Each structure stands twice: as structure tokens, then as C-alpha cells.
Symmetry: D3
Subunit: 156 residues, 6 copies
């Protein structure tokens, strides 16, 4: 059984993430969305809200499951009995930076990384930027799934 | 039932190629190496020399098959009953070019593309560069597989 | 009295082009689309087919005019009584190439260049890529304007 | 009446900024230099000194005015009755990064962004780097307008 | 007598650094590894351990010496009676960023900078990334000289 | 006994070139400018015109010599009793291309490459671009040295 882990902070999940989830889900037997803890960076939502927002936006994906990660991505991936990561890429800069982590991840663990190009529509969409805009009152509603919008309309 | 295509000219196959082959064969049920026809320009090796070279270097990959394509990659992909292309990336610049190709392929045919970062040790290997060096007497034997080295000796 | 020129081959105009046109026409009193002659190589469409295509897609832009240029863009620009070029950019790589052109144009003629980021939805559209796909039977109709789609049908 | 807002922190303004100011001022009816507040990042000068340094360096630009911005750039721009931003770009990396903000800024507000390539002379000039060098005793005097130099010769 | 300074934090030195050291040492009369103090960023090792780790890994390099730097790299270089810096580059992004510092360093001090491309083997190797992996239990032993490994096997 | 080679076509030499020459001549005991033969394509200037141009612009560089190379640069380099190539870099993109070349040269011949960032003032100068502009009547005289300007006048 083929499989890939999609790691990230998903704080919050965006239509950009959901496109990746779908695209990954179309090509692997299982996909595991791994929500990584950052103990240094406090963020807008906590895990329960995070998982919940991913679960609500991915109901149409049976082979996909959501799960909290800790420690080294590669350790998490291997603990899923998988050997592959799937990440989106918006630009060549992202690639130059993801490249190093991917080559490190192969070196230490035999875990490979597959990259998908962002969808043209959402290429400018990122969690941090959507937050800041939303904080300052801008309408980011067309860039996020409704589960996320409802919860934002609660943090007004 | 999971499957990816690796399109390219493989004129000739390199260790870089073989690496992508292995890496895709490990994650998909089926891999199809697609040797693509270009009219301008004609290669150094002929279509059958290329299939032979690809077959000869992939004997350890039982889920891997080699076919020859004409026309759009997506037409070729759709015709294998597959919806997914796999390619290696050397640099951020490669990515920016392939990103345009990838999105255009997805738009016209729902065919997605998965990218895989070069292995550190072959990041400089490309077939055009290896050929240029071999024509002028440089030893590229450690960058190509034995089947290829063989065919190259008989052009000294 | 504020004016910019959009130089290019527009062989043929795409929705990407039209987007830049609109975006420049909104910010300058006058926009001049400059169809530039290249000897090597000859296009797919002929000079008058290109003007027709540009006129036909810009009927909603009253401050926009189309002229044909030969030679250096800066000579053409200076001759419209203008000091400013406007171009779209797809990627960081586009920028690095155009940056050299821009600075060289400013040095030799005091002509400046204003760059405008591609619209997300057309970031993959270029005329050469659209042509390549159309020659091989892919549907690019959603990336080009109706006047162009029309002329393309009559080459199937 | 055409117009563009030049936003930044201008702490302090550099000959790099002044070139942009001039170049923008040559193509729009009005230009508004917007000095953005960062409540997180304390910096070398405060607003009054900032505005003053810009005002002293831009006396030769009648259509230009200087003004403090708050909140979302796009909200500021719209409050000036304008629909355009003008930013300098030094490299393809800057572009990849400015691209996302620009596409976001169009999405949420219809505000467009125009980019100008830095002048070859000042391509390495940036406020933060000039500060650090000046802090550590290096002579950055040829990279900053005299209004800024005099004030630095006061912070020795 | 020709010479170049190799500045960095070397916390800790990697096989990536050692390749650079060697390559620099092969082309200049002397090389001075300059270990720069960052008073803001606390790091894993302190200077004595840092110098010691470099000294133990560079015994085979007679023309090379190790030394603590303070203040402006260019001031340090000039204090060695040298006029050149040598740095490794992994990617085009690094280059775009090192370019600005190098052009600044020429401007203020006539100090030039030479760049060497990383070795394919170690292209993904960096001190910070090796630390994090090692912190989290990954085996980075093949990416660091034995002097560094022994000391890491002490911080378990 | 320290030495570097500067390979290139120098068709013709520019101020950019001369800058690299000076910068290398300041740091190595010997510099060899290597004018490399290309069959496709033939230049604007002939091999002896190029040597003359390089000699005429480097009279102030006593440790600099000009030879003509055929074949691989590394063969030419090894034959000067040298192990080092020196090249200028304009952009991150230049770097990514030259990085492949550099690593391939090191692999096949132990020949290393040192890169030097363009001087700000000539960052846009390349010989192909200067030629294109001169053919169409633009004044490139401030970007090339007098010996070259001379030979160009006699092609107006
Ligand atoms: N809009 C988008 N399109 C395609 N892939 C995206 C994407 N946004 C994010 N991704 C991918 O999915 C991964 C998980 O995202 P996160 O790390 O949770 C935050 P982000 O949205 O990437 O941007 P941020 O790190 O600037 O907040 C990212 O590393 C990226 O590879
Ligand atoms: N050393 C390497 N490492 C990883 N991927 C590589 C690689 N070399 C090539 N690839 C990928 O595999 C695909 C097939 O390659 P081809 O189109 O047959 C020729 P090439 O070897 O890429 O070099 P060239 O196109 O510069 O001659 C390419 O699209 C490329 O992305
Ligand atoms: N989809 C798009 N979005 C934004 N700008 C674009 C664009 N496509 C083209 N442009 C810009 O408009 C200018 C005119 O384009 P042309 O030179 O006529 C051909 P092209 O459509 O860029 O593709 P090609 O040159 O790869 O065939 C280009 O310099 C480019 O920067
Ligand atoms: N030297 C230069 N040449 C051209 N444009 C420049 C420039 N320096 C800055 N700019 C542009 O003007 C904007 C305003 O500058 P600021 O944000 O005040 C600081 P900065 O000088 O850009 O560099 P920094 O952010 O590293 O301090 C920048 O975002 C950049 O787009
Ligand atoms: N693996 C590698 N290959 C080639 N050059 C490298 C290299 N790692 C580092 N260098 C070069 O040597 C310099 C000194 O390194 P340091 O600043 O001590 C930490 P680093 O290993 O570069 O990565 P970091 O800054 O992400 O921790 C770097 O600026 C880089 O130019
Ligand atoms: N303005 C400049 N500043 C710094 N380095 C430069 C430079 N112009 C060229 N160089 C470097 O010197 C080397 C020799 O150049 P050549 O191959 O002779 C032609 P070119 O002048 O680079 O432009 P072209 O190749 O685009 O026509 C190049 O490899 C390039 O890296
Ligand atoms: Mg993130
Ligand atoms: Mg190819
Ligand atoms: Mg074109
Ligand atoms: Mg800033
Ligand atoms: Mg560092
Ligand atoms: Mg050249």
C-alpha cells in the first residue's frame, strides 16, 4: 500500500492546502495530513480547531486522514509505515529551500519528497498572509474553506 | 492502480534519470518511462537505442515499463489510464519553467505533475552536458549507467 | 499626457496580454501597444493579423492605440513622446532577464520600465506555449480571447 | 487624475529610494510616499525624523507628497483615491516575494502594483544594510542623501 | 602574498565548510578562517569549542589559520593585510543575497569576495539544519568531521 | 605560482570583463584570459580582433596574459599548470547555470571555479546585448573600452 504524508501547520487550512490534499489523494492509496507542533511559534488556532478545520474541509476524501505530528517529520512518516512526503510549491525560491530539507530527509531516513505546483488561482495564498489581511479587516473569504470562514466570523 | 509517467528524451539516460525512475517506482504501482519524440532536433542516439538503454538500466525495476510517445505528454498520459507525471528538478530555475508546463497540463487535461528533487550526487548531471563533455574526451562514465558507457565507447 | 508603451510580438495576443493592457490603461492617460518586428524568426500570424487581433480585443479600452515598431523599443518609445515601458512578469526568472533590458534601456535613452505581476489565473499563459499546445490539438480557448480563438479554428 | 502610492519604512531614506521617488514622479500625476508604522519593529529613527528626511530629499518633486500610513496598504491607497502601488525591485527573489503581496492586494482591493528595477548604482543599497554598516563605522555616505548624512553625523 | 578570509559562525563546522577551506587553501597563499561573534544569537558551541573543532578538522592545511573576528568583516580582512573574502554558495538565492553584501563590501572597503559552488555531496548541509536534525535524534554523522561528531556524542 | 584562468568568447570584451580581469589580477600571481573557440556560432569579431581587443584593454595588468583555447576549458586550464577558473556572475540565474558547469568541471578534472559578483555599474552589460543595441544605433560606448568603441565605429 502506497502512501504520502502532507506535513504543515495548517493554521488555518486554506483552499491552497485543500487543492494539495485533493491532488495528493488522487495519486496515493492513503494520505496523512500531519499537523506539526511548533512549541516556539504560538499561532492563531490550537490543534483541536486546526484538525477540526481540516476534517470539515476534507470530508470528500476517504483515503485521507488527519493526525498530529511531533518531532522529525521523517520519524512521523516512518511511524505511519510510509516513505514519502508531499508538499506544495509556489515559487523557485520555495523549491531552493524545500530542496535542502528534502535531500536531508532522504539522507537521514530514506524518506522521499514529492512536490506539486500550486494551482494558479491560489498561488498567492498562504496562511500567514491570509491571517494578517484578515486581522486588518480584509476579505480573505474566497481563499479559505467555509469551515475556516465561519470560525473567522467568530473571531471578529 | 496507482501510476505515474516519466516523460523525457533520455538521449541518453543518465544516473540522474535512473534515480528518478527508482524513486517513482518505489511509490507508485506502475511507472511508465515515456520516450518522447521531437522533430527539431534529432538526438545523438536513435529511438531504439534509447529504449534499449532505458530497458537495460531498469532491469531491477519490475513495475517499470518503457513506451514511446508522440504529441502532447497529457495525451500520452491519459492513454496509459494514468493522471500523473513525475519529473526531477535540479534548480529553482528548472522549477519556474516546469511550473508553467505543469499548470498548462493540468488545465487542458486534468493531468497533475509530481516533482522530485535531484539526488545531491547527480545534481549536475544532464544528458546534453554529459554528451558535450564526452564529445571532447572528458570521462563521464561515473554519471551514466554501464549500458550507456558501452554505447558511448563505440563512438570514440 | 501620462503614457506608457507595451512592446511585444503578440503572436498571438493572449488573455495575459489583455490583462496587462487593461491594467496599464487604468493608470496612464494613454497606452500604446507596440507590435515589434523580428526578422528571425517569422511568427505564426502576420503583422496585420496581429494588429487586427490586438484591436479586436481592446475595443473596451478607449485610451489604447496600436502601432507597429521596428528597431529599438526606446527609439519607438521616444517617438510616441513617451518615456515609459510597461511589461508583465510571470516569474523571478523573467525579472532577471528583463532587469538587464530595463537598465540598458534607461542608460541609452532615459526610458524607464514599469513591471506588473501576472494575474494568478494566467500565470502559465504565454503565446509560444499556447501555440505549441494548439498545434497538437489541446484546447487553449480559455486562455486566448475570442478574436484569436476564431483565427485559430481556421488552422485546424 | 492618475496616481501611485510608494509605501515603505524609509528608516532612513536612501539614494535608492530617491531614485524610485523620482522615477515614479516622472510617470504619475501625483505620488504619495507612505511611511508605514511597524509597532513590532522599533527602528533607528522616528516618524518625524523619517518624514523630514524624505521631505528634505524630495524638494525637487512637486507632484510628490509625504504621509504616514496605518493598517493595510490597500486601505491607505484607496483613502488617497488612488488604485496603484509603486515599489522598487533589486532581485528575482524580491519579485517572487512582492508578487504574492501584489496578487493579494489586487484580490482584496483592486489595487494594482507597479514595479521598477533598481538603478545599477544602488542595487546593493538597502536601509537595514546601510544602518549596520554605519553602526559599525563604515562610510555609507555615498548611498544616502545629505539630509540623512548630517543626521548620522549627529548619531556618532 | 595573496590571501582570503573565510568568515562564518562555524557552529559547528561541517564537511561542507571543510571542503571550502580546502578549496580556498589550494588557490591562495594564506587562508584565514574567521569565526564571527554574534552577540544577538546564542548558539550551540562557544568559541573555544568552535576554534578547536575547526583546528582539529584542518590540520592538513598549513597555509590556513583560525582566528576570532569582531565587527565588520571588511575591517577584519584589512587587519589581516588581505583584500579578499571566500564564501560557499549553495543556490541562486544565496547568491542574490551574498551579492548585495559583496557589493557593499567592495564599496566601503575595496574588499572583494570570491564564491565557490558547494560540492554536490554536501549541498544540503548547513550548520543550523544539521543541529536541528541532531537535536531531534537524526544521524548527521556523515555530514560533519569526526572532531564534531565526538563532541556531539557528548551532548547526548 | 597562484593562477587563475578567465574563459569566455569576449566578442567583444566589455567593461564588465575588464572589471573581472582586474579583480582576478589583484588576487592571483597570474591571470590567463582564455578566448574560447565555438564553431556554432561564429562571432561578430574574429579571433585576432578579440586578442587585440583583450591585449589593448589590459595593458595596465602586467600579470595578465591572453591565450586562445579549443575544446574543454578544463583541458585548457590543466595545460596552463593551473587548477582554477574565475568567472563573473550577474544574477542568481547565471549562478544556477554556472553551478552545473563548475561541478562538472571539478568532477572530471579537479578544476575548481571562483565566482565574482558583477560590479553594480556593469551588471547589465553583456556583449551580446551591447552588440544588439549597437547594430540598431544605440550608444554603448560607456559600457565598452576605447579599443572596442574604435573597432565598432568602423562598422557603422
Ligand atoms: N497556496 C498554496 N498552494 C500550493 N501549496 C501550498 C499553498 N499554501 C501552502 N502550500 C504547501 O503546503 C504546506 C503546508 O502549509 P503551512 O506550512 O501550514 C502554511 P503556508 O500556507 O504554506 O504558508 P506560510 O508558511 O507562509 O504560512 C506548505 O509548506 C506548502 O508547501
Ligand atoms: N540529474 C538529474 N537529477 C534529477 N532529475 C533529472 C536529472 N536529470 C534530468 N532529470 C529530469 O528528468 C527529465 C527527463 O530528462 P530529459 O528531457 O530526457 C534530458 P536531461 O537529462 O534533463 O538534460 P537536458 O535536457 O539538459 O539535456 C527532465 O525533465 C529532468 O527534469
Ligand atoms: N500571462 C501573462 N501575464 C502577464 N504578463 C504577460 C503574460 N504573458 C506575457 N506577458 C508579458 O507581455 C509581454 C509581451 O509578450 P510577447 O513578447 O508578445 C510573447 P509572450 O506571450 O510573453 O510569450 P513567449 O514570449 O514565451 O511566447 C511579455 O514581455 C511578457 O512580459
Ligand atoms: N536600493 C533600492 N533600489 C530600488 N528600490 C529600492 C531600493 N531600496 C528599497 N527599494 C524599494 O522601496 C521599498 C521601500 O524601502 P524600505 O522598506 O523602507 C527598506 P529597504 O531599503 O527596501 O530594504 P530593507 O527592507 O532590507 O531595509 C522597498 O520595498 C523596495 O521595494
Ligand atoms: N554545505 C556547504 N557547501 C558550501 N559552502 C557552505 C556550506 N555550508 C556553508 N557554506 C558557506 O560557508 C559560510 C559559513 O557558514 P556558517 O555561516 O558558519 C553556517 P552555514 O552552514 O552556512 O548555514 P546556516 O547559516 O544556515 O547555519 C556560509 O555563509 C556559506 O557561504
Ligand atoms: N558585466 C559583467 N560583470 C561581471 N561579469 C561579467 C559581465 N559580463 C560578463 N561577465 C562574465 O565573464 C564571462 C565571459 O563572458 P563571455 O562568455 O565572453 C560573453 P558575456 O559578456 O557574458 O555576454 P553574453 O554571453 O550574454 O553575450 C562570462 O561567463 C560572464 O560570467
Ligand atoms: Mg508554514
Ligand atoms: Mg531535455
Ligand atoms: Mg516573446
Ligand atoms: Mg523594509
Ligand atoms: Mg550562518
Ligand atoms: Mg557567452
Amino acid at each position: 500500500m502506497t502512501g504520502a504524508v502532507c506535513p504543515g501547520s495548517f493554521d488555518p487550512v486554506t483552499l491552497g492546502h485543500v487543492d494539495i490534499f485533493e491532488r495528493a489523494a488522487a495519486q496515493f492509496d492513503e494520505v496523512v495530513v500531519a499537523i506539526l507542533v511548533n512549541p516556539a511559534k504560538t499561532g492563531m488556532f490550537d490543534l483541536d480547531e486546526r484538525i477540526a478545520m481540516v476534517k470539515e474541509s476534507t470530508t470528500h476524501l476517504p483515503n485521507l486522514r488527519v493526525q498530529v505530528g511531533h518531532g522529525l517529520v521523517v520519524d512521523f512518516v516512518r511511524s505511519c509505515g510510509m516513505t514519502a512526503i508531499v508538499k506544495g510549491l509556489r515559487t523557485g525560491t520555495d523549491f531552493e529551500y524545500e530542496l535542502q530539507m528534502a535531500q536531508m530527509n532522504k539522507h537521514i531516513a530514506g524518506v522521499d519528497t514529492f512536490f506539486v505546483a500550486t494551482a494558479p488561482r491560489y498561488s498567492f495564498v498562504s496562511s500567514s498572509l491570509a491571517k494578517e489581511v484578515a486581522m486588518l479587516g480584509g476579505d480573505v473569504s474566497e481563499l479559505l474553506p467555509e469551515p475556516v470562514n465561519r470560525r473567522l466570523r467568530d473571531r471578529l
